[PDB]
């Protein structure tokens, strides 16, 4: 019944699973997420060595600012974490991870997402390549 949640979980799960081991939002996410991971690999390595992933997600947003860059960066860091779990043979944490990321995003930022027209806003914001 939460169709926004359902749709966010499918994109984020599929991205995390694919990286590790709607169609238009996925193509946007994989492209922008690859730039983010490639360009911030050392920061992401540093961060990985440290679900309080949840507290950190929310703390990103504490200054009262929400934007697609912060969102896509969080999801990208989730894919980075997912690829590590695959490397380390702990794929069973990948789905709880995607669930956690979706929960935190939809739970805390549902009003903002609605206002930005959901994943349609995401695709439009990143359209210029």
């Amino acid at each position: 019944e939460d169709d926004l949640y359902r749709q966010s979980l499918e994109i984020i799960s599929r991205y995390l699973r694919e990286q590790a081991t709607g169609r238009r939002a996925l193509e946007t996410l994989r492209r922008v997420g690859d730039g983010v991971q490639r360009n911030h690999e050392t920061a992401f390595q540093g961060m990985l060595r440290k679900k309080s992933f949840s507290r950190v997600m929310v703390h990103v947003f504490k200054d009262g600012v929400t934007n697609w860059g912060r969102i896509v960066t969080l999801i990208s860091f989730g894919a980075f974490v997912a690829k590590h779990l695959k490397s380390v043979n702990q794929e069973s944490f990948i789905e709880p991870l995607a669930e956690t990321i979706t929960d935190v995003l939809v739970r805390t930022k549902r009003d903002w997402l609605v206002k930005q027209r959901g994943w349609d806003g995401f695709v439009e914001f990143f359209h210029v390549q």
């Binding site: 922008v32 860059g69 912060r70």
Partner: peptide, 19 residues
């Protein structure tokens, strides 16, 4: 959290520059 926030705003700013 500071790191993800600043990276996220750098990505956002780049895309608004592109847009």
């Amino acid at each position: 959290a500071a790191x993800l926030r600043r990276i996220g705003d750098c990505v956002n700013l780049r895309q608004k520059l592109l847009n």
